[PDB]
């Protein structure tokens, strides 16, 4: 009965289940709060990729979270997390969540 | 003098507005003035509790097995429309029964 | 805030006590549940299940008045946990009514 909350790092199991890290099982940073995520079954989340090539909307994850890489803030997307069997991975520190929000807010014209 | 029976498809009024599949037996329905029924909808989505009606019955769509409720069929002016086949009734009861823990 | 009703919970609902029949795995996804009202015994309620004492509310569960409803809009709030035999008896009476 897990409900993702904002700041959670979660595993999302997209349709190519086979192939492990070569398949669709992706980590992501949740931006929307549980009070929305649990009602709608949807969430606003940004994908985490293992490799950073220095683009301006990347947000690097600090070490020892249990997942490594960069949050791609410009690829934030509304998605159905219930069908993708979301599972909690870690909690992002507040400064990562504030930096992702600042970058996405700038991209969205807020 | 009509009394809905299990498997009937009836029009029911709400404030004849909406079709429904009757699950409860006429013995109960006649005596109490109430009945357990599931709504019929045209909006089929592939939801697991949908049960498809066969083609030439007089109402189209799917029964929402998990949306069953007690309704006062007397006040809502229940009017028979058609009858569902035994398999539709069994699939609705089986799916609802699963949900209810039976 | 976090609360999702589970089968066998007694809950307060706006429109007030109700017994939840459907499990949380259904209830939390859909925002709906199957539940039966709690009221006082009456001759005209042939499918009643009496509640034990000390559950915050007394009375009978009306097994034949079970219905689908949206519990999120009704601000469902937990009241207690009914014993397994109350839930089993409600299921037994409702199942018979439904033709199962």
């Amino acid at each position: 009965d897990y409900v993702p909350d904002a700041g959670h790092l979660v595993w999302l199991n997209f349709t190519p289940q086979a192939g492990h890290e070569q398949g669709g099982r992706r980590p992501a940073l949740v931006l929307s709060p549980a009070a929305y995520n649990g009602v709608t079954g949807l969430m606003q989340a940004c994908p985490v990729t293992s490799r950073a090539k220095g683009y301006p909307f990347e947000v690097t994850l600090p070490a020892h979270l249990g997942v490594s890489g960069v949050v791609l803030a410009d690829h934030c997307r509304s998605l159905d997390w219930r069908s993708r069997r979301a599972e909690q991975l870690a909690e992002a520190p507040a400064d990562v969540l504030a930096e992702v929000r600042g970058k996405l807010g700038s991209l969205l014209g807020m | 003098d009509y009394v809905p029976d299990a498997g009937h498809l009836v029009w029911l009024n709400f404030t004849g507005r909406r079709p429904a599949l009757v699950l409860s037996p006429a013995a109960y329905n006649g005596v109490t003035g109430l009945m357990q029924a599931c709504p019929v909808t045209s909006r089929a989505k592939g939801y697991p509790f949908e049960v498809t009606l066969p083609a030439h019955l007089g109402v189209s769509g799917v029964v929402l097995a998990d949306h069953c409720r007690s309704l006062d069929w007397r006040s809502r002016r229940a009017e028979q429309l058609a009858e569902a086949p035994a398999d539709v009734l069994a699939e609705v009861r089986g799916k609802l029964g699963s949900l209810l823990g039976m | 805030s976090d609360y999702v009703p589970d089968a066998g919970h007694l809950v307060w609902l706006n429109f007030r006590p109700a017994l939840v029949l459907s499990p949380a795995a259904y209830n939390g996804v859909t925002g709906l549940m199957q539940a039966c009202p709690v009221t006082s015994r009456a001759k005209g309620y042939p499918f009643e299940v009496t509640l034990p004492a000390h559950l915050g509310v007394s009375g009978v569960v009306l097994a034949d008045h079970c219905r689908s409803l949206d519990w999120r809009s009704r601000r469902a709030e937990q009241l207690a946990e009914a014993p397994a035999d109350v839930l089993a008896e409600v299921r037994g009476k409702l199942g018979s009514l439904l033709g199962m």
Binding site: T40, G41, L42, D80, R82, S83 | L12, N13, F14, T15, R18, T32, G33, L34, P39, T41, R43, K45, G46, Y47, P48, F49, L64, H67, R69, S70, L71, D72, R74, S75, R76, G94, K95, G97, S98, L99, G101 | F15, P23, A25, Y26, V29, T30, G31, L32, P37, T39, L62, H65, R67, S68, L69, D70
Partner: peptide, 30 residues
């Protein structure tokens, strides 16, 4: 019908909200 298998087919994309039966009528208690 196995309930887990049914529930696993529900998604936010195929849900059906509460059926509108309007106001309570007659002997409907709630």
């Amino acid at each position: 019908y196995d309930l887990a298998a049914l529930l696993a087919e529900m998604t936010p994309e195929n849900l059906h909200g509460e059926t509108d039966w309007g106001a309570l009528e007659g002997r409907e208690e709630w």
